[PDB]
Design a protein around this ligand. Structure first.
Ligand code: YJ5
Ligand code: K
Ligand code: K
Ligand code: ZN
Length: 358
């Protein structure tokens, strides 16, 4: 009988915005998600995995010493220096606890990946903040200090073998620019992101997120960007992108571990997303991914800012991991026109690299 792991530690709530207590990357994101897991009796069904701090050596798997040093130094900064330092980055706020919280998010994911790979659990869910996928080797960005998901891929390889095949599926509504760049030349880590794009008119505002960035060097083919160019994208479009692109390429890659950069800011009612993926939609995406890697799937919270939407949606993913039957989902609504164009563009760009694409 498969076991699902869950990691959550309330200390990650201590990271906060000292100048706008209502900033959407709120401490209560993770406490609300946790409370919903309790209310729905999902937590009791999971094997509880402890949180830990990542070490500086583990952060060096993906991040420069200079970047680690500056964020580490924030732990001891006065408020005015914390405000100045955060303003040096694109969309970062920093408190004295931010470094420790970012370490806890990553270490929680390391312990979860270790639990999966050593067979203590089949799959796992990590209710963590601050998020990770915008963080670059050398810089913080977009509410993210260290790239939790990228680090976890490298940590996984470190405790198994260097060539362990890791799939990172990033379904946060924004492009994980950091994850793409860290693995852009790497054919051991397949990065697939779906994201609102709008010709660069959506954070992180760069053409790096377009469908024609397919990877570099021996990494060519191992970066798959599925960019959306409309709005009100929802279950039909995400289901179709998984059917035509994500699952065929993932099967051809044959990952041994699946990490999900699981932002829930493509969910209904999110001012930072504008999309309408339903909890049932997220369930179906999770369940499709469980078909890979002998079920070795780790779900990692990234963004997502409507407290009710992220709590319902992430709980539905945990329900899928636990083996519950996927809910009824509509399969008949026609796609938005732009979404057919996006999927077609990615298929044409990735035809050279993935023989099973049609
Ligand atoms: C101000 C420009 C319009 C909004 C914007 O671009 N912002 C918001 C700044 C504060 C809300 C930066 C941002 C947005 C989303 C994420 C995220 O959710 N990533 O996964 C990260 C960073
Ligand atoms: K994404
Ligand atoms: K890659
Ligand atoms: Zn996001």
């Amino acid at each position: 009988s498969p076991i699902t792991g869950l990691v959550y530690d309330q200390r990650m709530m201590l990271h906060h915005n000292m100048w706008d207590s209502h900033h959407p990357e709120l401490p209560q994101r993770i406490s609300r998600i946790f409370s919903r897991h309790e209310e729905l009796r999902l937590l009791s069904r999971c094997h509880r995995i402890p949180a830990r701090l990542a070490t500086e050596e583990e952060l060096a798997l993906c991040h420069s010493s200079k970047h680690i040093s500056i964020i580490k130094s924030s732990e001891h900064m006065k408020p005015r220096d914390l405000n100045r330092l955060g303003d040096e980055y694109n969309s970062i706020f920093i408190s004295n606890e931010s470094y420790t919280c970012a370490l806890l998010a990553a270490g929680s994911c390391f312990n979860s990946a270790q639990a999966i790979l050593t067979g203590q659990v089949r799959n796992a869910v990590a209710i963590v903040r601050p998020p990770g996928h915008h963080a670059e080797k050398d810089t913080a960005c977009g509410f993210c200090f260290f790239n939790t998901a990228a680090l976890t891929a490298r940590y996984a390889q470190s405790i198994t073998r260097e060539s362990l095949r890791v799939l990172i599926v990033d379904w946060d509504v924004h492009h994980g620019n950091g994850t793409q760049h860290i693995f852009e030349e790497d054919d051991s880590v397949l990065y697939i992101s779906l994201h609102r794009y709008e010709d660069g008119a959506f954070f992180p505002n760069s053409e790096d997120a377009n469908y024609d960035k397919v990877g570099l060097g021996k990494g060519r083919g191992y970066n798959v960007n599925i960019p959306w160019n409309g709005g009100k994208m929802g279950d039909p479009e995400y289901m179709a992108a998984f059917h035509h692109l994500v699952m065929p390429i993932a099967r051809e890659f044959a990952p041994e571990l699946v990490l999900v950069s699981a932002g829930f800011d493509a969910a209904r009612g999110d001012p930072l997303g504008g999309f309408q993926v339903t909890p049932e939609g997220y369930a179906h995406l999770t369940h499709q991914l469980m078909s890979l890697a002998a079920g070795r799937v780790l779900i990692i919270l990234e963004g997502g800012y409507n407290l009710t939407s992220i709590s319902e949606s992430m709980s539905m993913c945990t329900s899928m991991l636990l083996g519950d039957s996927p809910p009824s989902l509509d399969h008949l609504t026609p796609l938005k026109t732009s979404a057919t164009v996006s999927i077609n563009n990615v298929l044409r760009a990735h035809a050279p690299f993935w023989s099973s694409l049609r």
